[PDB]
Amino acid sequence: EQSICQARAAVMVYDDANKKWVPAGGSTGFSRVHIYHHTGNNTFRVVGRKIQDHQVVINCAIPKGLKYNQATQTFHQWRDARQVYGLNFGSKEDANVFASAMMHALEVL
Amino acid sequence: EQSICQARAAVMVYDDANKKWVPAGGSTGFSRVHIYHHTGNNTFRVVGRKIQDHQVVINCAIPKGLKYNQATQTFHQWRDARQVYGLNFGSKEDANVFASAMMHALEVL
Ligand SMILES: CCOC(=O)[C@@H]1C[C@@H](CC)[C@@H]2C=C[C@H]3CCN(C(=O)[C@@H]4CC[C@H]5C=C[C@]6(CCCN6C(=O)[C@H](Cc6ccccc6Cl)NC(C)=O)C(=O)N54)[C@@H]3C(=O)N12
Ligand SMILES: CCOC(=O)[C@@H]1C[C@@H](CC)[C@@H]2C=C[C@H]3CCN(C(=O)[C@@H]4CC[C@H]5C=C[C@]6(CCCN6C(=O)[C@H](Cc6ccccc6Cl)NC(C)=O)C(=O)N54)[C@@H]3C(=O)N12
């Protein structure tokens, strides 16, 4: 597993019942969010760990054809069949780094 | 893995930074919460799955010596080194079933 980017973001999931974003993994705060590339089968995953306690708060696949929505310059989101994920980036530079790597993955899948 | 109880509860985790309970796994709603016994090493785990979509929202160890707090007749809680867990039970009967199995586990560990 090779890291292809690192970006600072608060990782959020959407609680559709209450129509609001909640912190991924249950605790508010910033994470270091990677995209990891597994070269053996050319797969990519988003993996984020809390800066403070290292808890993995997101570990999700990036499937071919994913629609990655850059809602704002610092909040991007996507979904799977079960959850909606959001990254509230610490800076525009972090958002650009992460989006670049994401868009690359989606181009080579 | 043998189930020793099933109880209906909304599984919550405490957000230490934002001082609020958040739904475990990111989505509000009730789960079926088991305690499972692994006889090979006499271990016990709390495992809860959303009723609707089957998401595993809790899968945590029950260590010897755990302090299980029956805060109210329908809200019980405990913690590990990283998180605080809460079960908002659907009824007093559900709370009693779960608490009795938890207390059993803690007696035989
Ligand atoms: C003050 C600070 O607090 C906020 O403002 C809150 C918490 C802030 C972080 C702490 C966060 C930050 C920024 C803003 C940015 C705007 N935004 C929203 O949520 C917008 C508002 C409208 C709302 C409606 C829907 C919602 C959520 C549910 C998913 N979705 C969709 O639109 C999906 C999108 C999609 C499109 C294509 C592909 C994939 C996907 Cl996923 N569409 C569909 C068809 O699936 C969404 O994203 N929505 C954020 C926000 O409010 N907040
Ligand atoms: C009516 C309105 O109810 C609410 O609005 C919310 C949502 C309600 C439904 C989901 C839920 C239900 C019932 C009440 C019951 C009260 N309660 C709280 O959270 C109390 C209030 C004060 C607050 C402060 C701390 C907090 C959380 C963090 C853990 N902890 C501790 O005290 C721990 C406990 C502990 C003791 C021993 C062993 C293990 C552990 Cl874990 N102590 C320590 C030393 O670890 C806690 O439990 N707290 C609930 C609540 O408010 N709500």
Atom of ligand 1 nearest to the CA of A77: 41
Chain A from 21 to 50: CB within 8 A of any B CB: 22-24, 26-29
How far apart CA A9 and CA A95 sit, in angstroms, is: 8
Q: Enter the resolution in angstroms.
A: 1.3
Say how far apart CA B36 and CA B42 lie, in whole Å: 10
Shortest-distance Cα residue to atom 17 of ligand 1? A71
Write the burial class of residue A71 (CB in 10 Å: 0-12 exposed, 13-18 middle, 19+ buried): exposed
Cβ distance A53 to B24 less than 8 Å, yes or no, reads no
Query: Do β-strands A84-89 and A75-79 pair in parallel, antiparallel, or remain unpaired?
Result: antiparallel
CA torsion, ordered B38, B39, B42, B45, to nearest 10 deg: 20
| CATH code, domain carrying B40 | 2.30.29.30
Domain of B86? 1-109
**Overall number of domains in chain B:** 1
Residue B82 has its nearest CB partner, among A16, A28, A55, at A55
* Cα distance between residue B82 and residue B29, in whole Å: 23
Q: Which residues, including other chains, have CB under 8 Å from residue B11's CB and lie 6 or more apart?
A: B23, B24, B25, B31, B33, B48, B57, B58, B85, B86, B87, B88
Please name the amino acid found at residue B27.
S
Cβ B21 under 6 angstroms from ligand 2: yes
Residue B98 to residue A82: CA distance in whole angstroms? 28
C-alpha distances in angstroms, A40 versus A37, B59, B89, B92, B107? 9, 30, 45, 51, 47
Token digits of residue B18: 């934002």
Quote the CA–CA distance of A25 and B2 in Å, as a whole number: 27
Ramachandran region, residue A60 (left: φ > 0; alpha: ψ -120 to 50; beta: rest): beta
Residue A94 corresponds to which tokens in the numbers above? 């972090």
Residues linked to residue A79 through DSSP beta bridges, in sequence order: A84
